[PDB]
Design a protein around this nucleic acid. Structure first.
Ligand code: MG
Ligand code: MG
Ligand code: MG
Ligand code: MG
Ligand code: MG
Ligand code: MG
Ligand code: MG
Ligand code: MG
Ligand code: MG
Ligand code: MG
Ligand code: MG
Ligand code: MG
Ligand code: MG
Ligand code: MG
Ligand code: ZN
Lengths: 304, 211, 287, 166, 148, 152, 108
RNA sequence: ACUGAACUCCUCACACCCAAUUGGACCAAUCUAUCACCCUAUAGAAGAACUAAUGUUAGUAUAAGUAACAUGAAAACAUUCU
């Protein structure tokens, strides 16, 4: 007999358990906000070739943004909701070319996770997270498991790779999926308008692997490359990434620095392990901006 | 169907006009529907002449020893199911009342010696002579399943039974046979069975409630 | 040795269990009526001192064998595996009833008795373990309690977190056996024969015998282990699903010997709790 | 036609010795000519084929198929027979040992197709046979553990001989 | 074929040649019709050569039944309980005299496929090959790439 | 792809899905308890609670009278709407109906349902009660509540 | 397109007997506390609903008598009173359907 | 140098690997003659042998539980509504 958390509770115990575990939801998240007052792992300076952590952000939506050229840029809002560092594996255990942190974001009801997952977040002292992504990392960038990561981990002017599952379009035909031309409408054309034509030739008595056929479109992990961060918003933890991010609204994406070779040395002036707001040295404003973006509140621009 | 009225009321309503036809041959019975005068256990010498008028060689003194050999040989034929041997010792009012419930199960009835000699109690009478004889004997029982597991009575312990077995004789070729067995209302209850029984209550429709 | 104390006590329990069956008057038939909202006015024509309320539940369905836990024989709580005595009226009591009062208490004593079977057989043979009683503490208090007295070697002894996990792994091993609670109503004179080697349990037998206008005391047995109790119990040990010996508390007024109380918390298979609700019933069971 | 399943309830075993464990009851029951197909009945007969009779009546009260309403009429008449005729004391102490479905005598009608052609439509009938054995149901076979796979592999190595020689 | 039919190993009954040779027939049983052309040779076998046969091996006890049968049978029963019932239907006298001497010479084991044409029970005298025959031992038991 | 499409398509068009809910809602105002297929009940259930909001706009509102004139195909239920049902729920701001599951229809094995207007004169449905408060899991959680009330 | 060969019963058994086509065992089934008949979770009891559906069928048969023909839905709230019951203070100005039987244990 | 056939030798036994065609030795079952009598013998006879004709007829498969088929709604099953 399968059970759930709500089955054998009375109507006096249902709103009591709801307010209790949502108090321990906000107790465990508020006891992590000062990671430097704990014992942090040592803070190393940036070196050429070091790679640092990324983020996990909820895609909020898009809004236009203007530069001082007077050119409209579309900009996707990525809010960092309760993102933490969950665990650290060295390169000896990973058997890859780099070491890995594990990062989780957007807290989730504890009543709906497996028992083996609920103990991994009990030894860590956090509520469970929805997506758990794994970032390759060097030995310099290694934060203690359990520290939060904020949106000021990124800075404006920095280029960014964003990975999420695309919008699932179900079983789509071969015209929507692969952009096939189909058949003409009139002049006969009895039962062909949206059908794939020939699949293979006659001599090969089979269909090659990797042949474009009808199937389930979308719902796979895609990554966009080289997305500029136009501004950040330190109060609501918003990243303002240039352009369109894969995935629907309110999906969790995977934000990290760009792997593009043109943007490989551009981590010299970035906060290297992550942004620590316990550091307090030159505390950041409400909004950080790139130099080209017209801030709302600036006067109307003029090209004299 | 359930009754003979409910058949004719359905044969009328279906249109089944079944003709009650006349035949020359009738069902030639050899028993009665039970007992003539129901003896009630706690002068009938007219009925011993009306038995002697057709038989003309019959002694009322000899008959309780004849009544035992009718009773004992009828109950030993239950241990083997010799139905051709029950049909000469047991009338067809008594044969379905001692064989239908015991089909597909084995019985190991055995007679040990009696306590009191049998003696005739009453005699009553296309005419059927009828003799009730009292039996105070000592018997064992062991009734089993299809599967051979014991369901009633232990095999070794002999019990004490008080019996009033009404006998009957058709009066040209029939003999004295068992007809029925009087069970008085003041009799002690029988031996309790080995298993426990559930008895369901009323099977309730959702509109009907339990009062 | 507690090897020879187990073989000695169970033979006298079996001698008394065989003695009660020997007084049975050759399957005398009793007639009990089922009182309840469900399935009303059915009777069970049953044997006298062989039939149990589990045999009454076996006639109706499997649903009354699995879900039902106690038995309200004539408005009095009875075990499901305790033999009936006379013509009466039975209800069957479930954990999910509207008023599971006696069902909660009968489950509360049973995990106390299941705890005491773990305590005697966890210490190695050179250590002396002695059971006192099971205090009738309420369910609201958050843990069932069992007072034990250990040897003088273990006076400054307090178990770690890994010791209580070895207590629970022996308490789930008792659940995996699916052992039935062999109940038997014994007089006070035989009870002092079985519990002669334990002075703390002698005086507890004296409490229940004079509480009772006759000399009858409830005895129970899980498997090869006998214990006194105050009332009814559970049918089996498979009813306990979640189980944890939470904590050990040494009571404060102990001048002659440590009256060392054990704490545990448990829930049935019927009333399972989620991992996060159960973990909060563990930090409250440590008091 | 054959009706051998009806006659299996008339086998009378010899009365048992006390130095022998108690024989469980067997109750063979069937319904013939059910207007339902013999291989749509197999999914309902495979479902209940090891279950106890109270769990079988539970999983058939809530199946949407037509034959589940018919098997539940068969299993209820065979449970009423076991306390009446075949001497089982507990209704709940039964389990389904065999639950199969044969085909029945089927009728033939004419299905008209789109032209002068046609087809021969067969009105399907079926049987449903059950056997209840008195007792608790046996536990389902667990998957053989990694210990039991390792024993069979080592017993297969231990059994091999030098082949095609002395 | 051999994958259809059972098979066995070449054996004897009770080590039939080690101490003494025990004749393995116990009985022969002839059903022979008195009037019938199918047992014409079987009547001449009983008349001529069953008395010469029953003296050549006094361990076989022979029963001539002589009942009205259409097919005359010979039912050879052996010492290990096996029964080989064969027919002598319309056989000449020289063909039953070899059919019966074939029944005397053989043992009661089945005439299924014999796997090996031999049976050694101590096949090895110098010790059967294992991988550590014909392999020299290193000093101190040192396996390769082991320093100490 | 029907992301975000909240309306079931029924009937034989978008017109006939309104005429199907209209006869289902006219029967709900008249009888106050209706059996129907489960997809046709919970599609009606938005219209069954948006209608009582239009009866609480008042009798004399012409925008509310036109909506009750459409959505009630028997014109005797428009007095029952503005003078019985909308006065009955004038305290609460929502949740006028309760939708349950019935065992499936015996004809075609369809997932069935019952809506009813809350607080009617009809016999009560066998509602799914929560677990009682005196059960073992609820008493162990009641002991934890009273302790944590003493943390202040 | 027609089959090029005949599918055998070895191939047919592995298609029509794997657990994708087999009937799944359901675990919803509880016992109704009110009647003891067995119901599912998330579904009302079949027995206890037919209690209501045959008690509502009698009440609606008497509502149809007090109205008389169609289009007689009153603007007055309704109250069902069984035998030996008096209309209370809140039933003043309410339509009363006088039923014949006793007030059941589940009606209140 | 070894491997390597149905060649050749070896132990035993031999009428026992071609199409069409041709020669020969046997024979299942049936009926008849006479025997036989748990199923046969010698002969006489003939509707005298079926892994194959898009063979004929009957049964049952496969494709297949597939293609296809059906009942406007609520209800007091009086009625009303679309
Ligand atoms: Mg086009
Ligand atoms: Mg077209
Ligand atoms: Mg065309
Ligand atoms: Mg067909
Ligand atoms: Mg449709
Ligand atoms: Mg060679
Ligand atoms: Mg040759
Ligand atoms: Mg011939
Ligand atoms: Mg021919
Ligand atoms: Mg043929
Ligand atoms: Mg052919
Ligand atoms: Mg098929
Ligand atoms: Mg297909
Ligand atoms: Mg279709
Ligand atoms: Zn119910």
């Amino acid at each position: 007999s399968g059970t759930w958390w709500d089955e054998h509770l009375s109507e006096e115990n249902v709103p009591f358990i709801k307010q209790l575990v949502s108090d321990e939801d906000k107790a465990q998240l508020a006891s992590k906000l000062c990671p430097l007052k704990d014992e942090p792992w040592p803070i190393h300076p940036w070196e050429p070739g070091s790679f640092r952590v990324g983020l996990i952000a909820l895609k909020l939506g898009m809004m236009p943004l203007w530069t001082k050229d007077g050119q409209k840029h579309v900009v996707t809002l990525l809010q960092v909701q309760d993102c933490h560092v969950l665990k650290y594996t060295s390169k000896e255990n990973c058997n890859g070319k780099m070491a890995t942190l594990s990062v989780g974001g957007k807290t989730v009801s504890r009543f709906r996770k497996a028992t083996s997952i609920l103990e991994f977040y009990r030894e860590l002292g956090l509520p469970p997270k929805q997506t758990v992504k794994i970032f390759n990392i060097t030995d310099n960038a290694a934060i203690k498991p359990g520290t939060p990561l904020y949106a000021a981990h990124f800075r404006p002017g920095q280029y960014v790779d964003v990975t999420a599952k695309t919008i699932g379009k179900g079983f789509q035909g071969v015209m929507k999926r692969w952009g096939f031309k189909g058949q003409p409408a009139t002049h006969g054309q009895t039962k062909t308008h949206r059908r794939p034509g020939a699949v293979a030739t006659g001599d090969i008595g089979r269909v090659w692997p990797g042949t474009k056929m009808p199937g389930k479109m979308g719902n796979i992990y895609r990554t966009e490359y080289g997305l500029k961060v136009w501004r950040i918003n330190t109060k609501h933890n918003i990243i303002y990434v240039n352009g369109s991010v894969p995935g629907h609204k309110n999906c969790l994406v995977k934000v990290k620095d760009s792997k593009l070779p043109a943007y490989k040395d551009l981590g010299k002036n970035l906060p290297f392990p992550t942004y620590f707001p316990d550091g307090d040295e030159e505390e950041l404003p409400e909004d950080l901006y790139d130099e080209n973006v017209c801030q709302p509140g600036a006067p109307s621009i003029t090209f004299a | 169907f359930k009754t003979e009225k409910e058949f004719m009321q359905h044969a009328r309503k279906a249109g089944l006009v079944i003709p009650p036809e006349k035949s020359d041959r009738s069902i030639h019975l050899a028993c009665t529907a039970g007992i003539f005068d129901a003896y009630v256990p706690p002068a009938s010498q007219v009925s011993i002449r009306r038995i002697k008028d057709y038989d003309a060689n019959f002694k009322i003194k000899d008959f309780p020893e004849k009544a035992k050999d009718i009773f004992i040989e009828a109950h030993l034929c239950l241990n083997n199911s010799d139905h051709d041997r029950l049909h000469t010792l047991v009338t067809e009012h008594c044969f379905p009342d001692m064989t239908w419930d015991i089909k597909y199960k084995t019985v190991r009835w055995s007679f040990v010696e009696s306590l009191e000699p049998s003696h005739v109690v009453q005699v009553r009478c296309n005419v059927y002579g009828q003799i009730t004889v009292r039996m105070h004997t000592r018997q064992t029982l062991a009734i089993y399943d299809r599967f051979g597991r014991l369901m009633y009575g232990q095999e070794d312990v002999p019990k004490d039974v008080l019996e009033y077995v009404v006998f009957e004789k058709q009066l040209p070729y029939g003999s004295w046979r068992m007809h029925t067995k009087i069970v008085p209302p003041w009799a002690p209850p029988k031996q309790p069975i080995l298993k426990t029984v559930m008895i369901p209550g009323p099977q309730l429709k959702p509109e009907e409630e339990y009062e | 040795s507690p090897t020879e104390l187990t073989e000695m006590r169970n033979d006298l329990f079996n001698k008394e269990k065989a003695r009660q069956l020997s007084l049975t008057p050759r399957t005398e038939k009793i007639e009990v009526k089922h009182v309840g909202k469900t399935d009303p006015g059915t009777v069970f024509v049953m044997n006298k001192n062989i039939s149990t309320p589990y045999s009454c539940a076996m006639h109706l369905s499997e649903w009354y064998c699995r879900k039902s836990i106690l038995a309200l024989v004539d408005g009095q709580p009875w075990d499901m595996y305790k033999p009936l005595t006379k013509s009466c009226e039975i209800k069957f009591l479930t954990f999910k009833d509207c008023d599971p009062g006696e069902v909660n208490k009968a489950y509360w004593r049973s995990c106390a008795m299941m705890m005491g079977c773990v305590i005697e057989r966890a210490f190695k043979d050179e250590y002396m373990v002695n059971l006192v009683r099971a205090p009738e503490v309420p369910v609201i208090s958050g843990a069932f309690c069992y007072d034990v007295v250990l040897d003088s070697k273990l006076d400054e002894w307090m178990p770690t977190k890994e010791n209580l996990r070895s207590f629970t792994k022996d308490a789930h091993a008792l659940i995996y056996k699916d052992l039935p609670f062999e109940t038997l109503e014994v007089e006070a004179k035989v009870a002092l024969e079985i519990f002669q080697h334990s002075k703390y349990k002698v005086d507890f037998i004296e409490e229940k015998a004079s509480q009772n206008p006759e000399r009858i005391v409830k005895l129970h047995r899980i498997g090869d282990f006998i214990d006194v109790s105050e009332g009814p119990l559970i049918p089996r040990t498979s009813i306990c699903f979640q189980y944890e010996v939470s904590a050990v508390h040494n009571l404060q007024p102990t001048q002659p010997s440590l009256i060392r109380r054990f704490q545990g918390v448990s829930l049935p298979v019927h009333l399972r709790a989620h991992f996060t609700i159960w973990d909060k019933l563990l930090e409250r069971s440590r008091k | 036609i054959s009706r051998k399943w009806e006659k299996k309830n008339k086998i009378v075993y010899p009365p048992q010795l006390p130095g022998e464990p108690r024989r469980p009851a067997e109750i063979y029951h069937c319904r013939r000519q059910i207007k339902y197909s013999k291989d749509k009945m197999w999914y309902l007969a495979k479902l209940i084929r090891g279950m106890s009779i109270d769990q079988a009546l539970a999983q058939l009260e809530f199946n949407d198929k037509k034959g589940a309403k018919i098997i539940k009429e068969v299993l209820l008449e065979a449970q009423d027979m076991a306390v009446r005729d075949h001497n089982v004391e507990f209704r709940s102490n039964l389990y389904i040992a065999e639950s199969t479905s044969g085909r029945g005598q089927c009728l033939k009608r004419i299905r008209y197709h789109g032209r002068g052609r046609f087809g021969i439509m067969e009105k399907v009938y079926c049987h449903y046979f059950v056997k209840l054995v008195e007792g608790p149901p046996p536990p389902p076979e667990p998957p053989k553990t990694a210990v039991a796979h390792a024993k069979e592999y080592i017993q297969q190595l231990r059994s091999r001989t030098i082949v095609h020689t002395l | 074929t051999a994958r259809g039919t059972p098979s066995r190993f070449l054996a004897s009954v009770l080590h039939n040649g080690l101490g003494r040779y025990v004749q393995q027939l116990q009985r022969l049983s002839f059903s022979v019709s008195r009037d019938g052309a199918s047992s014409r040779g079987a009547r001449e076998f009983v008349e001529r050569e069953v008395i010469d046969f029953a003296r050549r091996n006094p361990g076989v006890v022979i029963y001539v039944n002589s009942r009205p049968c259409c097919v005359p049978r010979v039912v050879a029963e052996y010492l290990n309980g096996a029964v080989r019932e064969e027919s002598i239907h319309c056989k000449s006298v020289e063909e039953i005299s070899t059919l019966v001497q074939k029944l005397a010479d053989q043992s009661g084991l089945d005439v299924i496929r014999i796997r090996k044409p031999f049976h050694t029970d101590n096949p090895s005298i110098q010790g059967q090959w294992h991988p550590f025959t014909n392999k020299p031992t290193t000093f101190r038991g040192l396996r390769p790439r082991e320093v100490q | 792809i029907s992301h975000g499409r909240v309306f079931r398509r029924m009937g034989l068009g978008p017109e006939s899905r309104i005429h199907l809910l209209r006869n289902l809602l006219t029967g709900l105002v008249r009888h106050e308890r209706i059996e129907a297929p489960w997809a046709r009940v919970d599609e009606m259930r938005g219209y069954a609670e948006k209608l009582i909001d239009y009866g609480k706009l008042g009798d004399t509102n012409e925008r509310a009278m036109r909506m009750a004139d459409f959505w009630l195909t028997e014109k005797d239920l428009i007095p029952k709407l503005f003078q019985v049902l909308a006065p009955r729920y004038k305290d609460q701001t929502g949740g006028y109906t309760r939708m349950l599951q019935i065992p499936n229809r015996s004809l075609d094995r369809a997932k069935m349902a019952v809506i009813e207007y809350k607080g009617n004169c009809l016999p009560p449905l066998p509602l799914p009660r929560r677990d009682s408060h005196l059960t073992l899991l609820n008493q162990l959680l009641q002991g934890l509540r009273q302790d944590l009330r003493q943390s202040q | 397109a027609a089959p090029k060969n005949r599918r055998t019963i070895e191939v047919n058994r592995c298609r029509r007997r794997n657990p994708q086509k087999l009937i799944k065992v359901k675990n919803n089934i509880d016992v109704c506390p009110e009647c003891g008949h067995l119901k599912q979770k998330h579904v009302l009891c079949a027995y206890c609903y037919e209690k209501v559906c045959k008690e509502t069928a009698e009440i609606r048969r008497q509502i149809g008598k007090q109205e008389g023909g169609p289009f007689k839905a009153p603007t007055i709230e309704t109250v069902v009173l069984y035998t030996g019951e008096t209309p209370s203070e809140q039933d003043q100005g309410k339509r009363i359907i006088e039923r014949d039987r006793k007030r059941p244990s589940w009606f209140t």
